[PDB]
Design a protein around this ligand. Structure first.
Ligand SMILES: [Ca+2]
Ligand code: NA
Lengths: 64, 281
């Protein structure tokens, strides 16, 4: 199973959402600013996308 | 009837309960998304919100802080689950918005509130991949002030020989906690590295959820409060022990598992921790 998308770093949040939903159509996608703190529960259905101030991906997206 | 989740038994909390110790008079700050104070299996003693637009710390619109708090301190009664330290004084320090993110300044302000309000233990089931000097200073100050500070190691799994422990767990002054399952196997998501300190149950952990519910979650989020609750049990049996002593007692009495890069010192054992003489089992 594809569970990380390092090729998406530096792409637009729009392209990242599209690509992740092709690989994982039931994904629950959550967009958050890079450099924030988040809770440490592990959810197989979730993919957080951390964006910079330009709305580009700033951290490797992964399931969790 | 009440149920005792497997993880509370696995860390040997029932041995302290049978000795008569349940975290009474110990003040534990759950620095998190709030705690639902209306839940009948929780008693929340106080708290504060550091989230500018979400000023009620007793409303948990995320669900995460409520689950974490139940592992620390769900009440001993005839309902729901039983917490590790069911008599602890539980404080909701809300630093995450409903959306499940917080600014570094909000977490820092929550740590400062805990120090100013004489919390004995801080649990942070939270993290980020970068540090800041201000964040390190806040956790260092709490520990200098006598607080036991416990955090989730992170859910980054492995990355070759690199450490994947996030902050604030990665700071030396904070006890970073990874996750095992009921067979003591490291969970695949659990962060690794020389900063990993001890392990606790973090797979399929039943606890309290908002609106009088219960449910099983996974994460180093779930592992951290077993250790914060164990620190409260130890302090209720030894109210003069310093945070230094509470930390050593947990580290020095784990059940060793595998290599320390993946398992740190192994699984906590609060029964052994709370004796005067410490060794590993
Ligand atoms: Ca109960
Ligand atoms: Na640490």
């Amino acid at each position: 199973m594809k569970t990380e998308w390092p090729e998406l770093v530096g792409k637009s949040v729009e392209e990242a959402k599209k690509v992740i939903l092709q690989d994982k159509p039931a994904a629950q996608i959550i967009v958050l600013p890079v450099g924030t703190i988040v809770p440490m529960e592990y959810r197989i259905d979730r993919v957080r996308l951390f964006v910079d101030r330009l709305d580009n991906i700033a951290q490797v997206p992964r399931v969790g | 009837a009440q149920s005792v989740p497997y993880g509370v038994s696995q860390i040997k909390a029932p041995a302290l309960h049978s000795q008569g110790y349940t975290g009474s008079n110990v003040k534990v700050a759950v620095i998190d998304s709030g705690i639902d104070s209306s839940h009948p299996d929780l008693k929340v003693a106080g708290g504060a919100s550091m989230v500018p637009s979400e000023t009620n710390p007793f409303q948990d619109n995320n669900s995460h802080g409520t689950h974490v708090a139940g592992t620390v301190a769900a009440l001993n009664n005839s309902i729901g689950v039983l917490g590790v330290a069911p008599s602890a004084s539980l404080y909701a320090v809300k630093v995450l918005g409903a959306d499940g993110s917080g600014q570094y300044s909000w977490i820092i302000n929550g740590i400062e509130w805990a120090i100013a309000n004489n919390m004995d233990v801080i649990n942070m089931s939270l993290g980020g991949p970068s540090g800041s000097a201000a964040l390190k200073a806040a956790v260092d100050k709490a520990v200098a002030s006598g607080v036991v500070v416990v955090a989730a190691a992170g859910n980054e799994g492995t990355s070759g020989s690199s450490s994947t422990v996030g902050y604030p767990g990665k700071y030396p002054s904070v006890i970073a906690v990874g996750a095992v399952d009921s067979s003591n196997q490291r969970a695949s998501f659990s962060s690794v590295g020389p900063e990993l300190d001890v392990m606790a149950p973090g797979v399929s952990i039943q606890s309290t959820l908002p609106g009088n519910k219960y449910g099983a979650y996974n994460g180093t989020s779930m592992a951290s409060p077993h250790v914060a609750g164990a620190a409260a049990l130890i302090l209720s049996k030894h109210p003069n022990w310093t945070n230094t002593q509470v930390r050593s007692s947990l580290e020095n009495t784990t059940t060793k598992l595998g290599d320390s890069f993946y398992y740190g010192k192994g699984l906590i054992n609060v029964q052994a921790a709370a004796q005067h003489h410490h060794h590993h089992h």
